[PDB]
Amino acid sequence: TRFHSFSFYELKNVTNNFDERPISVGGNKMGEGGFGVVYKGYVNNTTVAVKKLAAMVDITTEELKQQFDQEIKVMAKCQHENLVELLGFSSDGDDLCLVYVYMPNGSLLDRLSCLDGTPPLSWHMRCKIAQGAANGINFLHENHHIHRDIKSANILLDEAFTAKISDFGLARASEKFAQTVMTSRIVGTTAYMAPEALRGEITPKSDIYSFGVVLLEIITGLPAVDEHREPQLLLDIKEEIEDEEKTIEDYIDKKMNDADSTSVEAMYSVASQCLHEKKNKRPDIKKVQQLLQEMTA
Ligand SMILES: CC(C)(O)c1cc2nn([C@H]3CC[C@H](CO)CC3)cc2cc1NC(=O)c1cccc(C(F)(F)F)n1
Ligand SMILES: [Cl-]
């Protein structure tokens, strides 16, 4: 209730038949992941994002349908300025679509890579984005949800670079947040996942680890995994710095002119604490929030 039920044919119309050319070149395609492709549309003068779900990795039709249903359930329960907003969906015929308010600055991942020639994010803007993302995760944890896929591709940016958490298809309710459960279907993005999540545990503490990797992407402007890089995994720079083979200053994004040592070391210190290999030693999201607020004094 509150979401609009669209026919598939209407969404076909407003995306120019899911036009696959990039938006940068006059098409409708904005991005994609393991569970679908996101297209730009216009519905009744409103710019929208339309995610058409697909098995882009190996996933059953039934699992896809459960992710669709979970997205709608979380978005029905959770409204917050640091979460994306669902307008509607379509489930008639074979295809599943979710329709959202459009995010004019795309994904934090794309902005950190300056995809399509966008200017590099200032350190000032990076600090505000880290704070907003932590406020969104805090709202989810306060509402007894575990996200399970926190990463820079799932943190979107509006016209004022307000951070919005997206993609609740893998989210799980936690019984009063305290109690860890096991699953036999291990999901998430390997380069972001806590060790316990890679073993099948489900706990909000795994969201904190993944957020640590996002903070390193913000500091460095490097992707979480790059097969043509040493180290391949960004989280391994933590070990390089701990074993004084390197310093955070060796990894700071060069595409900024406003990064002071003090606030960069403060953000690195939050990231380092989030990336504790032992889940019980990680700060909770409320502490992460406080540390990121103290960082900008
Ligand atoms: C798909 C992707 C990566 O997220 C996305 C990429 C974009 N690129 N741009 C360009 C950025 C560069 C600028 C040049 O100045 C012009 C526009 C706008 C975008 C908008 C996007 N997403 C959404 O609007 C959106 C909203 C809610 C829920 C979701 C969902 F869950 F489906 F991912 N997506
Ligand atoms: Cl996985």
Curated annotation (Swiss-Prot):
Residues 24-292 form the Protein kinase domain. Its cofactor is Mg(2+). The active site is at D149 (proton acceptor). Coiled coil: none annotated. The modification Phosphothreonine is found at T180, T183. Its EC number is 2.7.11.1. Transmembrane segments: none annotated. Changing G136D: In IMD67; decreases inhibition of NF-kappa-B complex activation; impairs neutrophil migration and phagocytosis. Keywords: Acetylation, ATP-binding, Cytoplasm, Disease variant, Immunity, Innate immunity, Kinase, Magnesium, Nucleotide-binding, Phosphoprotein, Serine/threonine-protein kinase, Transferase. One of its GO terms (molecular function) is ATP binding. It catalyses: L-seryl-[protein] + ATP = O-phospho-L-seryl-[protein] + ADP + H(+); L-threonyl-[protein] + ATP = O-phospho-L-threonyl-[protein] + ADP + H(+). The modification Phosphoserine is found at S184. One of its GO terms (cellular component) is nucleus. The keyword Lyase does not apply. ATP binds at residues 30-38, 51, 151-154, 167. GO terms for biological process: cytokine-mediated signaling pathway; innate immune response; interleukin-1-mediated signaling pathway; interleukin-33-mediated signaling pathway; intracellular signal transduction; JNK cascade; lipopolysaccharide-mediated signaling pathway; MyD88-dependent toll-like receptor signaling pathway. It is found in: Cytoplasm. Phosphorylated. Belongs to the protein kinase superfamily. TKL Ser/Thr protein kinase family. Pelle subfamily. It is linked to Immunodeficiency 67: An autosomal recessive primary immunodeficiency characterized by recurrent, life-threatening systemic and invasive bacterial infections beginning in infancy or early childhood. Serine/threonine-protein kinase that plays a critical role in initiating innate immune response against foreign pathogens. Involved in Toll-like receptor (TLR) and IL-1R signaling pathways. Is rapidly recruited by MYD88 to the receptor-signaling complex upon TLR activation to form the Myddosome together with IRAK2. Phosphorylates initially IRAK1, thus stimulating the kinase activity and intensive autophosphorylation of IRAK1. Phosphorylates E3 ubiquitin ligases Pellino proteins (PELI1, PELI2 and PELI3) to promote pellino-mediated polyubiquitination of IRAK1. Associates with MYD88 and IRAK2 to form a ternary complex called the Myddosome. Once phosphorylated, IRAK4 dissociates from the receptor complex and then associates with the TNF receptor-associated factor 6 (TRAF6), IRAK1, and PELI1; this intermediate complex is required for subsequent NF-kappa-B activation. Direct binding of SMAD6 to PELI1 prevents complex formation and hence negatively regulates IL1R-TLR signaling and eventually NF-kappa-B-mediated gene expression. Interacts with IL1RL1. Interacts (when phosphorylated) with IRAK1. May interact (when phosphorylated) with IRAK3. This is Interleukin-1 receptor-associated kinase 4. It comes from Homo sapiens (Human).
